[PDB]
Amino acid sequence: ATQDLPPISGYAPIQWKRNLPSRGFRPVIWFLGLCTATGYGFYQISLA
Amino acid sequence: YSSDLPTDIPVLSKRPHTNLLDYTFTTFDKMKNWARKSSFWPMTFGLACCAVEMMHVSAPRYDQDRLGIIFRASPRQSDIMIVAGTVTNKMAPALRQVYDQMPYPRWVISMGSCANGGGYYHYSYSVVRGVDRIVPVDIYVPGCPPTSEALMYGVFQLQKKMMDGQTHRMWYRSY
Amino acid sequence: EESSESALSKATKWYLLSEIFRGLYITLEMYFRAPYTIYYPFEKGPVSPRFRGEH
Amino acid sequence: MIPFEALIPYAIMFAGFCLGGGVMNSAITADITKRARGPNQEIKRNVGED
Amino acid sequence: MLNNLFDFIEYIEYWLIIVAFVASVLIVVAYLTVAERKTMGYMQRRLGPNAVGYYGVLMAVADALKLLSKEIVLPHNGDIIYVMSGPLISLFSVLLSWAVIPFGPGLSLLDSEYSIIYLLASGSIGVFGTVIVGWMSNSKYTVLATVRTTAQLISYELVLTTVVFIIALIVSSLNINVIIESQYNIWYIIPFFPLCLIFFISALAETARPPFDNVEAESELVSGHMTELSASPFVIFFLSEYCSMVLMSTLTAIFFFGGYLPFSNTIHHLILNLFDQHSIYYFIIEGILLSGYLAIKANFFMFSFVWIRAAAPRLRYDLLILFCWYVLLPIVFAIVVFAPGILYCFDALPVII
Amino acid sequence: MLQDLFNNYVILVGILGLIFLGVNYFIVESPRMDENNGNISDYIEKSGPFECGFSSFEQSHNPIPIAFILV
Amino acid sequence: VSTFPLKSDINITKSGKTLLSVGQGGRSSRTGFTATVFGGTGFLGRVVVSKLAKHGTNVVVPFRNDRARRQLKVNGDLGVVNFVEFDIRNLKSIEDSVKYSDIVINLIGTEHFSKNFSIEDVNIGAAERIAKAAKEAGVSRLIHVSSYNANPSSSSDFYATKGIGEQVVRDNFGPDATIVRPAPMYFRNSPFLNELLQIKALGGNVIFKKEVYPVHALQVGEAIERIAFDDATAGQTYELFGKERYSKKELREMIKHIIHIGQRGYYPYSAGFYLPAPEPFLYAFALIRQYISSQPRFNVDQLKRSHINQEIDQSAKTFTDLGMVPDELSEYLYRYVKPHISYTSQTQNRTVYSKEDIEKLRDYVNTP
Amino acid sequence: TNPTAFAQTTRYVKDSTEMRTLVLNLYRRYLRHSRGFVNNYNLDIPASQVRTKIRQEFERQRFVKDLPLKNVLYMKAQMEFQELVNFWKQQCHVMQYFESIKGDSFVQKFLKGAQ
Amino acid sequence: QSASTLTKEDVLTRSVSVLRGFEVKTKDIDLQTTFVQDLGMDSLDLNDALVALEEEFDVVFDDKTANEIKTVGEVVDFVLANYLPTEQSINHTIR
Amino acid sequence: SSSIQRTLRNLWKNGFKKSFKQLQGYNDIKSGRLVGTDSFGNKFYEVDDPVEIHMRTRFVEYTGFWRQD
C-alpha cells in the first residue's frame, strides 16, 4: 500500500528444477533404420 | 619567381564542388568512407568494468554485428581501438605498442572516466590520468560506466566524422 | 558388467551422435523465435527516474 | 515465425548458382549448335527461310 | 561494324562464360559470410548484419572494400613475397578445384576421367599455403597455428580421401559427372549415411571450421596464422577459407544427394514442358533448374556449416588426432571391404556406361 | 576431351589473384595523406611481431618439440 | 628540453606584454607564451610542437591534413595544443592562427611543385603572406626556416626561392625576423636518411655524390626553442650544421654495412642496391614522373642539387652563439638506422655501433 | 608450485663475511649477463657501458656498514637481477634507466625561480 | 671434433692480453703474477678481470674458484681443465 | 516480429515514401500511431501491433534522411 510488498496470498510457484526430458526412439530402432536404409540403398545400387 | 596566391579560397571543409573532378574524388572518398564506417572493426581491448558494457553492445539487445561491428583479437585486423578500462603505468607501454601495431587508418575511442581522465583513481600513484597522454583520442565517451547506448552513440559520432573524410579530394585541392 | 544400457545401445548413441543432434535441434528452435534486438537510436532501452547521467 | 531477413542472403546465393548454370547451359549449347550448321559463317549466323 | 562485331563476340564468347562462372562462385562465397552472420544471429536471438545496404545486402562489399583500402603491414615493401605467397597458394588451390564441379550434365570447365584425383590433389595444395605463413616467423602465435595446421591435415586427409574413394569404387569411376549421373535411382545418402556424416566431419576439419577450429581459435591463438596479416593478405586467406566452405558443401551435395539431379522427376518434366526446346529459353531455364537443384542442396550444407558452429564447442586438436585414427579410419576401412563384398555377392560389380 | 576452356580458366585464376594485391596497392591512400608516419619499413613499432602487448624473447629459430611426430 | 626551458620566470615580449611562467616546467606548468607553428604536422614541425607544448607553451597548429594533426595533441596538457584548419590560399585562416600568438614559426616549405602550388608559391608566397599577417597581428617574434644553401642567385629553384624567401620575409615582418638555415637533418623517419635507407635507389651514382654537413633534428628543434624564447636572437641568421662533412656515398655504404645487406655477397647487386643510370635518363624519368605519378618523386630540381654541395655562410651564426655543441652523426647514426636492420632479433649477438665504431666503419668504406 | 627462473630463496645472513661473498657472486652474474641485457632490450650502448653502469650502482652501496640494511639491499638486488634476466621489464624502462642525464649558481636559480 | 685444442702457452698469451686492457700496475704478467698485489686489483676490479677472462675463453668460473683465485697461473690452469667446445647443430658435424 | 507478413502490413500502412525512408535509416519497416512532435521536428510513434516485442513499442522518425542523431 505505502510500500512495495508481495500479494496477500503470495506469488504462484515457479519452475527451478532441471527440466530436460529425453526425446526420440530407442537406440535399437535407430540402428535398425540405419541397417534398413543401408540394405535398401545397396539394393537400388545393385539394380543400377 | 613571382607568386600570386589567391586570398579568398575556402578551406577544404568549406570548399564546394566546382568542376567534374571534384565530384569524382568526392565519390572516391564516400565509397571508402562508407566501407570503413560500415566495416567498423574494433579490437578486443577490455581492461576493466567499462568492458562489461562493451560486451553488452554485442549482446542480443543491441547486436553491434547488425551495424557491421566485429571485434578482432589482433591489431592488424582492427582499425578501431576502444580503451575500455583503467590504464595503469604498468599497462601504458603495452597499450602504446598495441596501438602502434594497428595499420592505418586507425581511430581510438576513450570510454569511461578511467580512460578519459582517470576517474575514481585520478589521484592514484599507479594510474594514468587519461589515455590521451599515450595515444591520440578521437572521441570521448562519458559515464562510469557509459551505458551500452552511450557507447553506441559515441560510435555513431565517430562514424559521422569518418563519413566526412576527404582524403582523396584533399590530394586534388589541398596538395 | 553393471551397465544398464546394452553395448549396442551405447554404440548407437555414440556412433550416431545422439546428444549432438539434440543440441543442434535446440539451436534451430531459437531460429524460429523472436529476437531481442532494439533499433537504437530509433528505439531506446528502459530508463528509470533514479537514473544518473549528465549533470 | 520464419525470419525472412535471414533467408535473403541464401536467396542471393541461390541466384549465384543459377547465374552460372543459366549462362553455361545455354551459351555452350548454342555455340555447339551454331557451329554444326555448316562450314562457313553465312550459314552459322543466317537462318534460312526453308 | 556489325559483321566484324558479330564474330568478335564469338571469338571472346568463352571468356565471358568463364568470367560469368567466376562471378557465380564469388557471389555465393561473398554472401556466405553474410548468411553465416545472419544465421548465427537468429540462433543467438540477435539479428545479424542489416544496416549495411538494404537489409544488409551490401555487408560483403563493405567488408571487402574496407580491407582493400587498408595498409599492408610487412617488415619491408620488398617483403611482399612473404605475406602474399601463403594466401595466394591457398586461393589458387581452391579456385582451381571448382573447375571440375559440374553445374549440369557436362557443364564443367574441366572434364576428365580423373576428376576425383584432381579434386583431392588440388585441395591438398591449399594446406601448403597455410604453412607458408609460419616461415621462421618471429610471431609465436603464427608458429603455434602452423603446428596445429599440420596436425589437422594428418587427421582428415586419410579419412576424407578414403570416403571419396568408396563412392568412386561404388561407381567404378573417378569422374565427378559420372558419379552424379549414377545417383538417378538412389541417392548415396541412403546406402552410405555413415559416410556422409564422416565426409562432413572431414570437411569441417579440412576447412578448419568449428568444432575443429583449432588453427584460428580466438581464445587460444588470437588469430592463428592470420594474426600478422592485414589488408589484402587477410582478404585472400579469408576468401580462400570461405571458398572451401562452399566447395565442400557443394561436394556433399554431389557425392550423397545426386548433385544437380532434380528432387522430383515429375516436377522437373512439368516445368520444362512449358518451354520450347527449339528456343534458347528452354536451356536458360534448364540451367537454372539443374543448378537450382544443386544450390538448394549446397545451401543446406552451408547452413549446416553455420549450424554446427552455433551449436557445438571447439574440440582440442590432440583429441581430433585420436578421433580420426582410432574411430574414423577403422570405420571407413571396414566399409571399403564391406562394399565390394556386397556387390560381388549379388553380381553387381560396377561398370562405366 | 578438349581442355582449352580449362586452360583459360587457370590463366584467369592466376591473374585474378594478382588483381586483389594490385587493387589494394593502388587504392590505399599514400602515407602523406594519412598521419604521415613514414614508410612501413621505418615504422618498426608497427612492423614488429605481436605478443599481446609485452615484448618477449625472440625465439624465431628455436627448436619446437612436436608431440605428434610419430603420428 | 631539460626541466625548465626559460632562463627567467618573467619575460617581456617585443610588443610590450609581460608573460609570467608558472610551475616547475612540466606538463601542468605554463610559460605564458602562445606560439603558432605553421607546418606543424611536418617532419620538423612535430619536433618543434613537442618541445614547445611539453613545457606548457600554448601552440596553435594550422593544418590541412586532418589525420596528421591528431598525434600532436598528446604533447601537451588540456587546452595547450590548438588546431586551426588553414590554407595558404585562405587569408582569413592564416590571420586566425596568429591572432593570439606571441611567436610565429614558419616551417612551411617544399622541394617539389604540384598541380596546385609551385615552388615559388610555397617558398616565397606562403612565407611572405605569413610574415605580413604576423606583423599586422602584432606578433613579437617571427622565426623563418630557410634551406642550408639559400642563395637568391642560385641556379636551383629550391635554393633560389629559399634565398628570396629570406629577403621577402625581412621586408614584410621587419628587421625583427630571425632566419634559420638548417643543414639536412637526421632523425627517425628523416627525409635525409630515408633516401639513403631505400634499397632501390635509382641513379645512386648521380644523386649520392652530394656532400653535406648533417645536423641532428632534435638539436634543430632545440635551437628553435632557444631562439623563440631569447629576444637577443632577433634579427639574426643561424646556420645549423654538424662539424663533420659527409658525402651521401659514404653514408650509403656505411649504412649498407650496418643493415648487414652484405651478409650475402650476391644480394646487394641482385636486390638493386646499385642502379647506375645515365643522368640524361634520370632527367627524363624525373620529368615524366612530374606529371604521371601522384606522389612526390625525385624531381628535376633535386637532380640539379646533386651537383651542388652545401656551402656554409661564414657571416651567419651557429650553435656557439646559442650556447650549444652540435651533435655528431657517428653517435646517433646507429639508433636511427636500427629499425631497418634486416634480421637482428637477438639471434646470436646484436652489433651495436658506438661513436668509435662508426668512425672506424667510415675508414673501411673509403678503404679500397 | 615451482619457482620461476633465476629465483632465489630469501634468507637473512647473520655473518658479515658471508654477505660479502654473496654480493660478489651477484656482482659477477650482472657482468656475465651484460651482453644479454643489450640483446634482449635492444640498447643503443655497447655491453661495455652496461658493465660500467652496473659497477657504478654497486659502488654506491660499497660503504654500507649495517648488516640488516645489507640483507635488504642484497634482496632487492636479487629481485632486480631476476626482473632483467627474465625479460619482465619492458624495453622502455631499461632505455630510461640508461637515459639518466656543474650546477647553476645562486643568481641563475634566483632569476628563474629556483625551488 | 668436440675436444679442447688449447695449450698452456696460448692460454697464458691471451690471458696477458686481456689483463693489459685494464689499468693494472704492471704490464709484466706471468703465471706467478698476483691480482691483489702485483696488479693492484680491489674487489670489484678483480671480478671485472675474471668476467673479462670468461668472455675470452668462453668459460665460467664457479663461485668457490672465483672467490679463492690468487694468481694468473691458477686462471690458466682452470681454463685448461674446464674448457670445452660448444656443441654444434646436427648439420655442422655430419654433413 | 521477424515475419514477412509484419513487414507487408507496415509497408501498406506507411506507404512508399514513409517506408523507403525507414529502409534508409531504420533498417526496418514499422508503423504506429502518431504521438507528437518535438521542437526540432522529430516525430514520435507508438505501436499497437501485438507481435511487437517488449522494448520496441515506441520509436522516432528523424527529420534527416541520410544521417540520424
Ligand SMILES: NC(=O)C1=CN([C@@H]2O[C@H](COP(=O)(O)OP(=O)(O)OC[C@H]3O[C@@H](n4cnc5c(N)ncnc54)[C@H](OP(=O)(O)O)[C@@H]3O)[C@@H](O)[C@H]2O)C=CC1
Ligand atoms: N633535411 C630537411 O628536411 C631540411 C628541411 N628544410 C626546410 O625546413 C622546413 C621544415 O620541413 P621538414 O619538417 O624538415 O620536412 P617537410 O618538407 O615534410 O615539411 C614541410 C612542412 O611545410 C608544409 N607545407 C608544404 N607545402 C605546404 C602548403 N602549400 N600549404 C601548407 N603547408 C605546406 C607541410 O604541411 P603538410 O605536411 O600538412 O603537407 C609541412 O608541415 C621546410 O621548409 C624545409 O624546406 C631545409 C633543409 C634541410
Ligand SMILES: CCCCCCCCCCCC(=O)OC[C@H](COP(=O)(O)OCC[N+](C)(C)C)OC(=O)CCCCCCCCCCC
Ligand atoms: C565498384 C566497387 C564495388 C561497389 C561499391 C559500392 C559501395 C556503396 C556506395 C556507398 C554509399 C554511400 O556512401 O552513400 C551514402 C551517401 C550519403 O553520404 P552522407 O555522408 O551520409 O551524406 C552526404 C550526402 N548529402 C550531403 C547529399 C546528404 O548517399 C548519397 O549521397 C547518395 C546520393 C548520390 C546519388 C545516388 C544515385 C546515383 C546512382 C548511384 C549508383 C550508380
Ligand SMILES: CCCCCCCCCCCC(=O)OC[C@H](COP(=O)(O)OCC[N+](C)(C)C)OC(=O)CCCCCCCCCCC
Ligand atoms: C534421419 C536422418 C536425420 C537424423 C539423423 C540423426 C538422428 C539421431 C540419431 C541417434 C538417435 C539415438 O541414438 O536415439 C537415442 C536418443 C536418446 O534417446 P534415449 O536416451 O535412448 O531415450 C531414453 C529412452 N526412451 C526412448 C524410452 C525415452 O535419441 C535422440 O537423442 C533423438 C534426437 C532427436 C532430436 C534431433 C533430430 C533431428 C536432427 C536435426 C536434423 C538433421
Ligand SMILES: CCCCCCCCCCCC(=O)OC[C@H](COP(=O)(O)OCC[N+](C)(C)C)OC(=O)CCCCCCCCCCC
Ligand atoms: C558403423 C557406423 C559408422 C558411423 C559413422 C559416423 C561416426 C561419427 C563418430 C562417432 C564417434 C564419436 O563421435 O566419438 C567421439 C570422439 C572420441 O570420444 P572418446 O575420446 O572415444 O570418448 C568417448 C567414448 N567413451 C564414452 C567410451 C569414453 O570425440 C568426439 O566427441 C568427436 C565429436 C565430433 C563431432 C562432429 C559433428 C559435426 C556435425 C555432424 C552432423 C551433421
Ligand code: SF4
Ligand atoms: S570508468 Fe568506471 S566503469 Fe569504466 S573502468 Fe573506470 S571505474 Fe570501471
